[PDB]
Amino acid sequence: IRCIGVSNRDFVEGMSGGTWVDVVLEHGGCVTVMAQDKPTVDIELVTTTVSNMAEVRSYCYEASISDMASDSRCPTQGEAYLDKQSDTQYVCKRTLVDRGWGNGCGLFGKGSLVTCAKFACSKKMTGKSIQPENLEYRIMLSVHGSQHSGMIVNDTGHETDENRAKVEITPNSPRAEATLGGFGSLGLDCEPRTGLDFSDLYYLTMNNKHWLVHKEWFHDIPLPWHAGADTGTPHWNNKEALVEFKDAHAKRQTVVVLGSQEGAVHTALAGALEAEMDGAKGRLSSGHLKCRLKMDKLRLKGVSYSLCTAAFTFTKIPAETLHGTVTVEVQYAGTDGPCKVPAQMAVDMQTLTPVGRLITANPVITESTENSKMMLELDPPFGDSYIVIGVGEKKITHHWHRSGSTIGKAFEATVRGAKRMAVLGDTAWDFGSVGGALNSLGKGIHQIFGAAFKSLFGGMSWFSQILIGTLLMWLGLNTKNGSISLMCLALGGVLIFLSTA
Amino acid sequence: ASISDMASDSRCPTQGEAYLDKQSDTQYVCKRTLVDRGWGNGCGLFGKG
Amino acid sequence: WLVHKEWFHDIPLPWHAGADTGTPHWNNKEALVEFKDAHAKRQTVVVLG
């Protein structure tokens, strides 16, 4: 539920402290935590909103020049003077122009020419600062079990549903509890402050389009700019790079503006996150969080219910998720009240031997009516198998066939781990971090190597990186030392970072 | 450039490919891609739409 | 016939996609019409049979 079809989900099967299991949530996917005797919980981060940001250093990307003026000095005089020069709303440029006996000034030296033009801005972009406060993560929980078929994607009814919860986390209240009626309460302890390394990201708006932008890229953009919150008529600094004082045949100056500078900023913003904004709040579209899950107060609703003695039917038979798990929807005909559903995966129906794993929980049917509907998902074995539901001589059975082999599963697991590391750094070492001594040392050495690799490299983007990857591959192949091992490892790191895509 | 009335279509996990009737017009930009569907969107199957 | 997929995708003919609604549109416009050139700016269009 909430996770079935996502196609980017991973299971955090296992809990070796009897207690909390660390977990890192991303915008793309969702995490299904399954324990020994505790119901399978599905968690997903939904939206991260930022509100009441402060404003810093807005830039002007479309200039306009109001009125030109110019003055020439007849070479042996003082300097070309305009009273406008002292007004800081005007652009003034001084050059030398040929003069004499044609223009009425008797001498033939070079003279001074000053041209000034009024600078008036047009629509323009604002950067804003994301402080650690005022940042709110919304986390949705849901629970497997008696859920209907549709309830995986329904919109509202959270407070009424009793199996789904919504948790808001802010650095003012990092730790929260989700109260699931009848299942107990699941505790989330999260570190919001170190989520996506904010305090390096400005929120940038141009015209109803908003992005995240690195502080350095923003502070290194050449355009007219004035610091602080705007109002009224501003005082534009660096009133150039939008005004071009081109020269005529050594006798004039013409002042032109560079038009609208907006597509250049759009293509300059290559590799920055998008964002959408409604009202004052802006909801980011990508991030990640690290929440440990105190599952010490999760109970099991189903236990101490007698088995159901009726017949079951397949409404839509089975679906197969991308990851191989099978989702089944069963309809119950009898009326025994709340009772367990006996379900398993078997081969050799003569002797039903449990093969595979049933990843839902103790399946239950909550309602007590004529016909009820429930959904459960189970993890089949790689061979051909039968889905068995029911007890005796009425047990509905289905045939189900899964393609992969255990080696393929291990290979895909290592690939998923590699992608997660490439995306998250050491916080990937914090993914299922029940917490030992090997894991902590792994995280430590990964922190050190990551700091070094980010300081040396990490100023490249998919082509400088691929080129230096090939070059280090060669130089490591043919340098004849232990530096061969050094350079081949550097090549592996860089090229994997590239071809993750 | 300026843009106008967006539209979209999607046709399942195991059917053909989406086709808008506004693809037979030389004034519309159209892009075709894959989306995750199944058990929460309306079509029972779980591949890529 | 029963045809193996990857033979019903690597076939070079004008291909629609799925829903037949009104006046069809084929996204190929190639491999079934031969634009044979003449000489001295003469151009002719034929179909393959």
Epitope: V153, D155 | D21, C43 | D20
Partner: antibody, heavy 131, light 101 residues
Framework: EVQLVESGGGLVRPGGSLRLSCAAS????????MHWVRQAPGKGLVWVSR????????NYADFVKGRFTISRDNAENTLYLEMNSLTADDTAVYYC?????????????????????????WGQGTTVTVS | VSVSGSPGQSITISCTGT?????????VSWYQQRPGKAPKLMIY???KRPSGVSNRFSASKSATAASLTISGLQPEDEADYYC??????????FGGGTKLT
């Protein structure tokens, strides 16, 4: 129960513009498809247009060659139908319709081909007179 | 266009589209409009009847037409009946309507 209320219908000259509105309450408006249908005086029902929850997909009948523009605001539970270059053939009662059958798909976004439907929740309709 | 009936009898209104994929009638919906009243739907998905609509109304469908059957006619039943379905994948179209007296 859900109640739909039309507004904005009135007399206008041929070639004029007119903006019809529909107010909804009592259900998850942000998740249901919405339809505009019309019925000429003494005539039958004629489907006009439909839109999704978010406003991404908009479908219009053949008789509207871009004259109509359907839109909505989920936060305000409001539906709008802009109309330009009115003629006499469009003088009729316009009914605002809720689409709950799609709400199979509780999102109301994905516009599958030939998806199941049936229109039971209608507004009272507003009269437009092009005279 | 119209059908006449006596109290207690059964009447069938047919809906036919010409050469439409031989699929369409699976999704035909039937709507009732009493004189001066807002239209009410009696049938959707071809044969499924909503809750609250009387069991008096029934529906059937084939590869060539759809039929709406009202048994035990009552004076209330006199109204205009309209069938609707897809013209193409993105469209909807209402039938010519039948006035049942």
């Amino acid at each position: 129960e859900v109640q739909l209320v039309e507004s904005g219908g009135g007399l206008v000259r041929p070639g004029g513009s007119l903006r019809l509105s529909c107010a909804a309450s009592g259900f998850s408006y942000s998740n249901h498809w919405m339809h505009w249908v019309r019925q000429a005086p003494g005539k039958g029902l004629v489907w006009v247009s439909r839109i999704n929850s978010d406003g991404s997909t908009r479908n219009y009948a053949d008789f509207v060659k871009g004259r109509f523009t359907i839109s909505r605001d989920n936060a305000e539970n409001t539906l709008y139908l802009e109309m330009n270059s009115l003629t006499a053939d469009d003088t009729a009662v316009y009914y605002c319709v809720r689409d709950g059958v799609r709400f199979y798909d509780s999102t109301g976004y994905y516009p599958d081909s030939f998806f199941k439907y049936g229109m039971d929740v209608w507004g009272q309709g507003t009269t437009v007179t092009v005279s | 266009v119209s059908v006449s009936g006596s109290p207690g009898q059964s009447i069938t209104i047919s809906c036919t589209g010409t050469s439409s994929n031989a699929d369409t009638y699976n999704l035909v919906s039937w709507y009732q409009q009493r004189p001066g009243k807002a239209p009410k739907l009696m049938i959707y998905e071809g044969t499924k009847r909503p809750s609250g609509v009387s069991n008096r109304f029934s529906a059937s469908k084939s590869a060539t037409a759809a039929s709406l059957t009202i048994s035990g006619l009552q004076p209330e039943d006199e109204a205009d009946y309209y069938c609707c379905s897809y013209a193409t994948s993105r469209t909807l179209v209402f039938g010519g309507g039948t006035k049942l007296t």
